[PDB]
Ligand binder design. Structure first.
Ligand code: CL
Ligand code: CL
Length: 270
């Protein structure tokens, strides 16, 4: 059947146009769905379909063997544009990893493991902005990732402040280590854009919280600690390293990707 590829392409177009609830994202099921929703050239899509049919070497199924030879025939026929071809498949692999960062970030947020959550959400947010640079359908819901990155910062800040309010030397030092390790270094990320008003207000809310302890009386060696810390939190400088190493992802199957995405989207309460 010289048209099995045309049948399959027409099926994926239909899948690509279906309206689906937030837990279901057929871009995670097939690279060609990602391509269709992102206006990939018809030729990029056909080559991807032909290679999915024609890449194998062996078959025990007469009908599939024949479809394999047909696809290998068309593929063997300047029109290749390999850099464009590799670029689209790299973009899809980045979409899958971005999804996996987001899932682990949201899973840990829901478990209230905010230290583990935060870096995944920050990485997901930044990768997602890089995807959406290239088009509207390249990535994930910006307002959702924006919401959880911001709420995860505020909850970790709450955790650090309540440690500080306890007034014990170990807990104060631990709270200040949280602020200096996980929060202060990423404050510039939430100030980059004046249009992102909720992020601006959240940075101001975190800064007010730590300043309001000036209005409280406490052990003076702790007051010296607060006094050295506050300039760090209130600093005007936007100095931030340009590359950050991403947290480690455990190996995962596409099956895991899709199912864990569905499961966290369905249990999240926002
Ligand atoms: Cl949708
Ligand atoms: Cl959806």
């Amino acid at each position: 059947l010289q048209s099995a590829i045309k049948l399959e392409y027409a099926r994926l177009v239909k899948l690509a146009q279906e309206d689906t609830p937030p837990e279901t994202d057929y871009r995670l099921h097939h690279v060609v769905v990602y391509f269709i929703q992102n206006q990939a050239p018809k030729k990029i899509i056909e080559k991807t379909l032909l290679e999915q049919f024609g890449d194998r070497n062996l078959s025990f199924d007469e009908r599939c063997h024949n479809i394999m030879k047909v696809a290998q025939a068309k593929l063997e026929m300047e029109e290749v544009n390999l850099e464009e071809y590799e670029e689209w498949h790299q973009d899809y692999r980045k979409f899958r990893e971005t999804t996996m960062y987001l899932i682990i970030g949201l899973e840990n947020f829901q478990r209230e493991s905010y230290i583990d959550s935060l870096l995944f959400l920050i990485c997901a947010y930044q990768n997602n902005k890089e995807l959406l640079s290239k088009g509207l359908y390249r990535g994930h819901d910006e307002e959702l990732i924006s919401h959880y990155r911001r709420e995860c910062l505020l909850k970790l800040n709450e955790q650090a402040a309540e440690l500080f309010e306890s007034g014990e030397d170990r807990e104060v030092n631990n709270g200040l280590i949280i602020m200096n390790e996980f929060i202060v270094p990423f404050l510039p990320l939430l100030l980059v854009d004046e249009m992102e008003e909720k992020d601006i207000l959240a940075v101001e809310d975190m800064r007010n919280r730590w300043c309001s302890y000036l209005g409280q009386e406490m052990e003076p060696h702790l007051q010296e600690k607060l006094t050295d810390f506050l300039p760090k939190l209130l600093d005007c400088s936007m100095e931030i390293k340009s590359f950050h190493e991403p947290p480690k992802l455990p190996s995962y199957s596409t099956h895991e990707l899709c199912e864990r995405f569905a499961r966290i989207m369905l249990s999240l309460s926002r």
